[PDB]
Design a binder for this molecule. Sequence first.
Ligand SMILES: Cc1nc(C(C)(C)O)sc1-c1cnc(N)c(O[C@H](C)c2cc(F)ccc2-n2nccn2)c1
Length: 292
Amino acid sequence: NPNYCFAGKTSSISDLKEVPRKNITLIRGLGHGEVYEGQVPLQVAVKTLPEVCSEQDELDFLMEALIISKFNHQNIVRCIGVSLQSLPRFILLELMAGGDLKSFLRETRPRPSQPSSLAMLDLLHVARDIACGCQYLEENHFIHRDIAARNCLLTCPGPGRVAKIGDFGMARDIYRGGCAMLPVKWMPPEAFMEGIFTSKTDTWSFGVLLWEIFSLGYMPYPSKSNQEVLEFVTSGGRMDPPKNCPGPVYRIMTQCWQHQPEDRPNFAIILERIEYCTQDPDVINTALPIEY
Ligand SMILES: Cc1nc(C(C)(C)O)sc1-c1cnc(N)c(O[C@H](C)c2cc(F)ccc2-n2nccn2)c1
């Protein structure tokens, strides 16, 4: 059984809350290991470990259970418990009915049918929610390493939605692989060049997430491959503003993408700037593009 340290304290597999398998019912697949919607009545997302896997896969699975169970913050998905004493093994997460952020943005883009389905303020609230999660990780000296829209979840589709960081598979791998798998489009130069990760790693990635949000779910660096992005960013290149993106919001992005990690803002500053954007009528009165 592997050890794990967060906020100082060390924990073990024994500290995980084991839920009796009989209390757990699977309802439907969500996507593929496989994840199901389930009930324990508490509604849960059930992350499963394939019964056919390597011992490294097992260790990875246990470790992410330890990681998520030890966080306590409103913008990080909760772990209800685990079921490790039956096969296949389960990790039980808070079921975020809004689904993942990237799908949400893609499916909820304003259109002729729904012209105002989404507004700038909705995007700013998502951005603020995730930044608050990142600030919590930063102040607890946890480096996420893969801050990206695909790794965020929403509590519901409607205006009251809350965004949370929902996946920690990358930080898990490095805590203990391939180049064409590293999220190079979300990584700062010192990360993909030198393998150096610091709190300022997540700041850069958050800038890219910001772009994903205000582009409404487009893939970063449109039309560029990983290697072209690597060379582009290493040469000082940066993404243009998303369509209709207010200057104050783009400015947050460009500050997140400063070449020197020391020149990039910490998350307390990012949150201050996101707050200012939400107060600025010129920002929130800006209409999102309508997709025909
Ligand atoms: C209801 C629901 N619908 C979704 C769609 C199909 C739109 O994508 S995801 C989703 C959901 C809700 N709550 C969770 N706790 C949860 O967790 C998994 C581990 C997860 C966590 C992430 F951070 C990112 C992605 C995924 N993931 N997505 C598919 C498979 N894995 C998923």
